[PDB]
Ligand binder design. Structure first.
Ligand SMILES: [Ca+2]
Length: 433
C-alpha cells in the first residue's frame, strides 16, 4: 500500500544508467555496467560514442532515443519539483544530457545526422556484455539526399526541450543545444521524407508511420525554447495543413499527436487544442479497452508503456485545468497498476514479485571473466543483475503474465518504455501523491 513514487523515480533513473553506451562516468551508480561501444564512429571516423542502447540490445536507434530525450526533458520542465523532492534533479538532468551530448556528435554537419550505430542483425545475433562485442557496428545517416524529417524533427524537439532544462544551470550548453535544434529543424522541414526509407535497416525495428507530426512537434518545442513567433506560426500552420486535429490520439515514439496537442494548448491557450485533448482523455477513461483489473490496453506491444504514456498525457491535461482531479486520479491508477495494484509489480527490482528475467543482455550477464553468451540467455535462473527501474511490456488483455526471458513481448524493456512512465512519476511526486 502507498507506493514510494520518489524511489520509483530514482529506480527509473537507474534503468537509464543501465542503458548507457560509451565511456561511463566515475559517479556511475549502476556499476556492473562497463565502458563499451568505444569505437562507434561515422563515415569519416567522427566520434559517435555515447548515447543510449535502445532496449535489451546494443543498437543505438536514433528515433526512439530522441523521443525518449524529449519526453524526459518535458517532465523535467513541467515537474521539476518532483525531481527535486526525490533528490534526483541532478540525475534527471544527466539522463537528458546523456542523450543530447550524443545527438550533438551525431549532428556531423548542418544537414547531416547519424540516426543509427550498430546493425539490427549483427547486434541481435550476439548475446553477452556490450564491452565484449567484436562485430562491426555500421553507422547510418540521413542527409539532403536521404531525408528524415521524423528523426531530425524529433531530435530537434529533444534538443530544444533540453535547452530549456539547462537554460539556467548551464547557459553555454543551453545555447549549443538550441543552435543544433534550429539547424536540425530546418533540415527536417526543408528536406521532407521518412528516415526509415533512408536508413533502411531501421524499417524493420522502428519504422516511421508518418513524419508530419514530428514537424509540428519540433516547431512547437522550438517556439517554447526561443519565444520566436515564427516557430509558433509554423507549428500551427502545419498542424492545420496536416489536419492533426483528426489524427488518431496517443503519444509514443512513433506518434506525437497527443503531445503536440496538449503542448500547443499550453503554448497558445487556445480552446480548440483543449477540446481535442479533452475528447481524447475522456475517450481513454470511459471507452478504451481495459483489462479486467483496470489497465488501459492499447496494444500487445509495450502495453504498460502505452498506458503510462496515456497517464502522462492525462497529467499534462490536468495542468491545463481539464478535470484535474479525475484526470490525475486515473493517471495514478495506471502507474499504480504498473507498480503492483494488478497483483504484482511490472517494474524490475521493485515491489511484489517483479519480473526477474527481462529480455535484456547486459543485466543477464555474470561479471567478467566468466563467459556470457547464448547459454546465459538460455539459463533457467533469473537475470544475474537486477535491472532496477525497467518497465516491462506487461500482462495481456486479461492481466495474465509469465516472467520469461525469451518472451520479447511481455518482457521487453526499452528506453522509450520508461520515458512517459518516468515523467508521470515526477508529476505524481510534484503533486504530493
Ligand atoms: Ca510520426
Amino acid at each position: 500500500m502507498a507506493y514510494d513514487y520518489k524511489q520509483v523515480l530514482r529506480d527509473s533513473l537507474l534503468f537509464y544508467e543501465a542503458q548507457r553506451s560509451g565511456r561511463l562516468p566515475a559517479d556511475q551508480k549502476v556499476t556492473w555496467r562497463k565502458d563499451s561501444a568505444l569505437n562507434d564512429q561515422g563515415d569519416q571516423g567522427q566520434d559517435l560514442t555515447g548515447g543510449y542502447f535502445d532496449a535489451g540490445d546494443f543498437v543505438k536507434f536514433g528515433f526512439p532515443m530522441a523521443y525518449t530525450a524529449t519526453v524526459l526533458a518535458w517532465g523535467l520542465i513541467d515537474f521539476e519539483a518532483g525531481y527535486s523532492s526525490a533528490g534526483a534533479l541532478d540525475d534527471g538532468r544527466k539522463a537528458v544530457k546523456w542523450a543530447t551530448d550524443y545527438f550533438i556528435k551525431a549532428h556531423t554537419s548542418q544537414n547531416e545526422f547519424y540516426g543509427q550505430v550498430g546493425q539490427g542483425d549483427a547486434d541481435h545475433a550476439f548475446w553477452g556484455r556490450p564491452e565484449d562485442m567484436t562485430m562491426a557496428r555500421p553507422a547510418y545517416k540521413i542527409d539532403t539526399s536521404r531525408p528524415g524529417s521524423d528523426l531530425a524533427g524529433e531530435t530537434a524537439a529533444a534538443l530544444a526541450a533540453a535547452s530549456i532544462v539547462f537554460r539556467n544551470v548551464d547557459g553555454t550548453y543551453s545555447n549549443n543545444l538550441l543552435t543544433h535544434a534550429r539547424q536540425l529543424f530546418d533540415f527536417a522541414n526543408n528536406y521532407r521524407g521518412k528516415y526509415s526509407d533512408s536508413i533502411t535497416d531501421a524499417r524493420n525495428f522502428y519504422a516511421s508511420a508518418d513524419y508530419r507530426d514530428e514537424l509540428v512537434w519540433a516547431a512547437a518545442w522550438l517556439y517554447r525554447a526561443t519565444n520566436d513567433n515564427t516557430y509558433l506560426n509554423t507549428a500551427e500552420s502545419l498542424y492545420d495543413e496536416f489536419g492533426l486535429q483528426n489524427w488518431g490520439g496517443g503519444l509514443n515514439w512513433d506518434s506525437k499527436v497527443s503531445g503536440v496537442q496538449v503542448l500547443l494548448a499550453k503554448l497558445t491557450n487556445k480552446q480548440a487544442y483543449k477540446d481535442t485533448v479533452q475528447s481524447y482523455v475522456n475517450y481513454l477513461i470511459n471507452n478504451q479497452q481495459k483489462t479486467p483489473k483496470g489497465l488501459l490496453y492499447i496494444d500487445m506491444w509495450g502495453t504498460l508503456r502505452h498506458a503510462a504514456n496515456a497517464a502522462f498525457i492525462m497529467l499534462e491535461a490536468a495542468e491545463l485545468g481539464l478535470s484535474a482531479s479525475s484526470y490525475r486520479q486515473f493517471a495514478q491508477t495506471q502507474i499504480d497498476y504498473a507498480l503492483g495494484d494488478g497483483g504484482r509489480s511490472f517494474v524490475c527490482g521493485f515491489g511484489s514479485n517483479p519480473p526477474t528475467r527481462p529480455h535484456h543482455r547486459s543485466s543477464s550477464c555474470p561479471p567478467a571473466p566468466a563467459t556470457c553468451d547464448w547459454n546465459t540467455f538460455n539459463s533457467p535462473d533469473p537475470n544475474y543483475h537486477v535491472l532496477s527501474g525497467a518497465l516491462v511490456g506487461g500482462p495481456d488483455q486479461n492481466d495474465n503474465y509469465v516472467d520469461d526471458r525469451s518472451d520479447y513481448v511481455h518482457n521487453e524493456v526499452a528506453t522509450d518504455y520508461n520515458a512517459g512512465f518516468q515523467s508521470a512519476l515526477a508529476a505524481l511526486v510534484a503533486l504530493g501523491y
